[PDB]
Structures are given as C-alpha cells and as structure tokens.
Design a protein around this ligand. Structure first.
Ligand code: ZN
Length: 148
C-alpha cells in the first residue's frame, strides 16, 4: 500500500523525474494515490509523498453532483503565472500539525497528460491553482514550510 512520507525523509527533497505515460500503470498509481489522499482527507497529493519520485500529482474535485473524483496530472508543468498573488493557509499530509499563510500566484496555466494520456492545458485559478502549485512544488523537492 502507499504510505505517506513526512518531513525529515530525504525523498521529499529529491527532485522527481519525468514519466513515460502508460495507461494501465497510471491507472494503478492513480487508484493508490487517491486512496491515500482521501483516507487522510486531503485534496491533493504528489507521488514523492508516497515514495515515488516521478512527476505525477492528483487533485481532488469531489462534488455533490458527481461524487468523489480527482484529476490525474502526469508531467505537470506551469507555463504561466499571474502577477497577482493571493494568500492561503496551507497544510500538507507530509508536514503534519503545521500550517501557515503562503503567498502564491492567483492563477496559472498548466500543461499535463491526463488519466487517458491526452495532452491538456488548463488555465486555473482559486483553490485549483493553489493545490496544483503546492503539489508541483513537491516534484521540485519543495515543502510549503520553506516559504516561511
Ligand atoms: Zn503537500
């Protein structure tokens, strides 16, 4: 099963490597990441948090209308960030019992491969832009406490 690594583990500081997409393998990884994320009431997770230093994140988007759902983002890359910043109180399953206000760009554009291997580009803002930037930071060996 996937176990979530916590601050002090050096694998949280190693940069993650690009994935060559495989639909079946990503499906398995997706299922296990979602399970780990949701079991601890998270809304994002990066592969290095579960000991896999590959460039894969998941972002919750559970709704009343459609039920539990999360986006898979393989090799996510920010191609644009707004000049405008917003402050948000962050936490992290890999940094338990710590929170704090972090300034980041309010909106971004991100490219990635989805669950099905299609190349996507989305313009994100609000909470989606926040979770994506936090999760991509994990792939660069960055924890949110580094901003303080
Ligand atoms: Zn995190």
């Amino acid at each position: 099963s996937l176990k979530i690594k916590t601050i002090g583990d050096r694998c949280l500081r190693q940069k993650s490597e690009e994935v060559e997409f495989d639909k079946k393998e990503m499906s398995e990884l997706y299922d296990q990441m979602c399970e780990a994320m949701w079991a601890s009431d998270g809304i994002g997770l990066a592969a290095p948090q579960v000991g896999i230093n590959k460039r894969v994140i998941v972002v919750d988007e559970t709704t009343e209308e459609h039920g539990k759902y999360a986006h898979l983002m393989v090799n996510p890359k920010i191609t644009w960030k707004s000049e405008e910043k917003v402050l948000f109180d962050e936490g992290c399953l890999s940094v338990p019992d710590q929170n704090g206000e972090v300034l980041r760009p309010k909106s971004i554009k991100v490219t990635f491969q989805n669950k099905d291997g299609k190349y996507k580009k989305w313009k994100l803002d609000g909470l989606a832009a926040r979770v994506v930037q936090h999760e991509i930071d994990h792939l660069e060996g960055i924890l949110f406490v580094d901003y303080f």
